[PDB]
Amino acid sequence: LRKFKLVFLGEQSVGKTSLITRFMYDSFDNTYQATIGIDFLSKTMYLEDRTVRLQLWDTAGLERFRSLIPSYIRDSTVAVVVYDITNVNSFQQTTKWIDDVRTERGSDVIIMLVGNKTDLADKRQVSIEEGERKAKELNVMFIETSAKAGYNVKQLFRRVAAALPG
Amino acid sequence: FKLVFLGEQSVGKTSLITRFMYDSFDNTYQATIGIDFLSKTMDRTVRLQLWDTAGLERFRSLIPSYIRDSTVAVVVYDITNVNSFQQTTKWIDDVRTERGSDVIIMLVGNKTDLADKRQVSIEEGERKAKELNVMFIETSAKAGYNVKQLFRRVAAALP
Amino acid sequence: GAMEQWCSERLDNQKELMEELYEEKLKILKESLTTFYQEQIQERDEKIE
Amino acid sequence: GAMEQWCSERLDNQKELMEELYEEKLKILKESLTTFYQEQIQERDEK
Ligand SMILES: Nc1nc2c(ncn2[C@@H]2O[C@H](COP(=O)(O)OP(=O)(O)OP(=O)(O)O)[C@@H](O)[C@H]2O)c(=O)[nH]1
Ligand SMILES: Nc1nc2c(ncn2[C@@H]2O[C@H](COP(=O)(O)OP(=O)(O)OP(=O)(O)O)[C@@H](O)[C@H]2O)c(=O)[nH]1
Ligand SMILES: [Mg+2]
Ligand SMILES: [Mg+2]
Numbered sequence: 101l102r103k104f105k106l107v108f109l110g111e112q113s114v115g116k117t118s119l120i121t122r123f124m125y126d127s128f129d130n131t132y133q134a135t136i137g138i139d140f141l142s143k144t145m146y147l148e149d150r151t152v153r154l155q156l157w158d159t160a161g162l163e164r165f166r167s168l169i170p171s172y173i174r175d176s177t178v179a180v181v182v183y184d185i186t187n188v189n190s191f192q193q194t195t196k197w198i199d200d201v202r203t204e205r206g207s208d209v210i211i212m213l214v215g216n217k218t219d220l221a222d223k224r225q226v227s228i229e230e231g232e233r234k235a236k237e238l239n240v241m242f243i244e245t246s247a248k249a250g251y252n253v254k255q256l257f258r259r260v261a262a263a264l265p266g
Numbered sequence: 267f268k269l270v271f272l273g274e275q276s277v278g279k280t281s282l283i284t285r286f287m288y289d290s291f292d293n294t295y296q297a298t299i300g301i302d303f304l305s306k307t308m309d310r311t312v313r314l315q316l317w318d319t320a321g322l323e324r325f326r327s328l329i330p331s332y333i334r335d336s337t338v339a340v341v342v343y344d345i346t347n348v349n350s351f352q353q354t355t356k357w358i359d360d361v362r363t364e365r366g367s368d369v370i371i372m373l374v375g376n377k378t379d380l381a382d383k384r385q386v387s388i389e390e391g392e393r394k395a396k397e398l399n400v401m402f403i404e405t406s407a408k409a410g411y412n413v414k415q416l417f418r419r420v421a422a423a424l425p
Numbered sequence: 426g427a428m429e430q431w432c433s434e435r436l437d438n439q440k441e442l443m444e445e446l447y448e449e450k451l452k453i454l455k456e457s458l459t460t461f462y463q464e465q466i467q468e469r470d471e472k473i474e
Numbered sequence: 475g476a477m478e479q480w481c482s483e484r485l486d487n488q489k490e491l492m493e494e495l496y497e498e499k500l501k502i503l504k505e506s507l508t509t510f511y512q513e514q515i516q517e518r519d520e521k
Contacts, residue, residue, distance in 0.1 A: 103441075136459065137506050140452040155448065168506055171499055299461075300454055300504050303497060324461045328453055331446065432481040439485055440492070447496035454500060455507075462511035469518035 101144070104264055105155045107172050109197045110182035111190040112161030115216040118247035119182065120156055123257050128248050135160040137168055145261050152264060154257075174204045178260055182214045183231075185244065186223035191215070191231070198238050210263045211240040214256060219246040267424050268315045270332050272357045273342035274350040275321030278376035281407035282342065283318050286417055291408050300325050301332060312421060333364040338420050342374040343391075345404065346383035351375070351390070358398050370423045371400035374416065379406040 108116040117135055122128055124143055141156040157172050159165070173179060179201040183190040194213060201211055215231040218224075228244055235242030241259060245252040271279040280298055284290055287306055298320040306314045317332050319325070333339060339361040343350040354373060361371055375391040377383075388404055395402035401419065405412040 103444075136510060137503060138455070140448065140455060164510065165506055168502060171495070299508055300458065300500070303501070322461070324457050328450065328457065331450065428477060428480075431477075432484060435481055436484060436488055439488055443489065443492045443496070447492070447499075450496070451499060451503065454503060458504065458507045458511070462507070462515070465515055466511070466518060469515070472518075 101151050101153050103153045103155060104177040105157060105172075105175060106178040106180060106260065107157040107159060107169075107176040108180045108182065109159055109169070109173070109201070110161060110214075111184075111187075111193050112163075114161065114182045114184040114187070114190050115245075115247050116161070116180075116182050117158055119180075119214070119216060119245060119253055119256065120158055122247045122250055122253045124156075126250065128250070130248075134162060136162075137165045138172065145257070147261060149266070152261065154261075170200070170204060173201055176205070176209070177264065178210045178212070179205075180212045180214060180256075180260070181240075182216050183226070184217050185215045185226045185228075185231070186217055186220045188225045191226045191234075194234065195238070198240060210260065211238075212256065212260055213238070213240050213242045215242075215244040217246060217248070218244050218251060219249045267313055267338065267421075268317060268332075268336040269338040269340055269420065270317040270319060270329075270336035271340045271342060272319055272329070272333070272361070273321060273374075274344075274347075274353050277321065277342045277344040277347070277350050278405075278407045279321065279340075279342050280318055282340075282374070282376065282405060282413055282416065283316055285407045285410055285413045287316075289410070291410075293408075297322055301328055308417065308421065314417070314421075330360070330364060333361055336365075336369075337424065338370045338372070339365070340372050340374060340416070340420065341400075342376055343386070344377050345375045345386045345391075346377055346380045348385045351386045351394075354394065355398065358400060370420060371398075372416065372420050373398070373400050373402045375402075375404040376407060378404050378411055379409050 110116055113132060118128060120141060124141065135158055137160055139158040141158065142153060143156065144151060144153050157176065159169050159172065181194050181197045183194050198211060201209055213235045215226060231244065232242050243252055243256050245256055247253060271283065273279055275297065276295060281291060283304060287304060298318055300320055302318040304316040317336060319329050341354050341357045343354050358371060361369055373395045375386065391404065392402055403412050403416050405416055407413060
């Protein structure tokens with residue numbers, strides 16, 4: 101049961117916590133509860149090859165907690181960078197987030213870029229093409245999700261798990 | 267040489283450390299949250315590493331691990347509060363559970379300056395220390411009484 | 426060689442255990458701080474009268 | 475012997491560093507949450 105650390109990063113209210121909740125408990129809550137500093141969770145994934153335990157480090161988007169995050173990026177195996185497809189600023193900031201991750205880990209880190217809230221179709225401001233082009237520019241994995249609809253959340257974690265070192 | 271400070275709420279754990287560290291004292295009560303760390307030098311090169319723990323119940327579960335790594339345990343009570351004194355038995359038991367006999371323990375009766383409010387006699391403190399086989403001292407963080415001796419006596423007992 | 430492998434194993438084990446210990450401390454610290462302050466915030470929130 | 479002394483030196487160092495790193499995490503985590511929640515409590519207290 102090898103252990104791996106996933107850190108979740110992104111601007112406030114993009115859906116970092118909701119993605120984790122959907123994966124862990126297959127549930128969703130519309131009521132917003134901002135992450136305070138950081139939250140620690142754990143989940144085992146019984147892959148075909150072996151079993152792995154994922155430590156899930158759910159960081160806050162609130163600016164006041166930014167100083168906490170570097171050490172967790174530094175000690176993480178995977179960085180999941182989330183934005184909100186209905187919010188252009190959140191997407192524009194992902195270059196900065198991926199910059200920070202590379203700064204701490206270089207190429208020795210798996211990065212997944214996530215465009216969340218696909219269910220809010222008429223509010224979309226970031227096309228799936230834009231998200232895909234950004235991820236390719238930065239050589240990171242890409243996926244779009246809806247924590248609310250439960251769309252592509254399992255796929256997100258399966259893709260990440262499959263990329264883990266052996 | 268790690269020292270962990272243990273005891274019920276508001277007995278003077280932080281005040282003793284602050285008196286030894288900075289020779290200052292505050293009458294205003296600020297409850298310790300979680301566990302705080304400090305370090306200091308004091309005839310040999312003293313390398314004291316102090317762990318100041320919360321008396322608040324909510325943070326009790328954090329303490330055990332720190333007792334394991336601490337070579338010394340300083341168990342503090344308030345001479346004006348008999349319950350704080352009674353609980354030191356439990357505290358010392360826990361130190362034994364984590365360290366057995368390979369630990370230096372000092373039982374501290376603090377706030378000697380509050381003579382008019384003393385509920386615990388020095389004889390009672392000395393008795394408990396003998397019964398539990400630990401060192402004993404009474405202090406006043408406010409006055410600075412026996413605070414230097416507390417650390418000097420604990421230091422001299424280090425391996 | 427065999428000397429480097431033996432020490433790598435022991436260094437890995439120490440890293441694994443210390444990670445386990447301190448990540449548990451961080452978690453408990455987070456939960457305790459949260460629980461501690463939420464009560465104080467709840468008390469004052471109860472006072473809407 | 476010489477092997478045990480060499481590995482003990484590296485283990486001691488690794489332990490010392492990890493202690494430093496994780497205690498820094500604990501400290502700054504606590505300080506961040508304290509500052510935040512105190513402001514929250516003050517706001518309730520100021521009304
Ligand atoms: N419609 C829709 N809403 C979502 C989705 N995911 C999250 N939300 C909502 O967006 C708000 C923010 O979700 P969170 O998971 O708390 O976002 P966060 O990134 O963890 O926020 P911080 O921890 O403060 O940085 C909440 O009200 C959620 O219910 C989604 O996929 N679709
Ligand atoms: N008169 C007098 N008051 C003291 C003395 N030592 C501490 N106090 C007071 O007692 C109160 C508690 O002191 P602290 O050092 O914060 O007690 P503590 O054990 O660290 O409290 P917790 O961290 O909550 O467990 C404060 O108001 C101090 O001013 C003392 O020696 N004499
Ligand atoms: Mg969150
Ligand atoms: Mg204190």
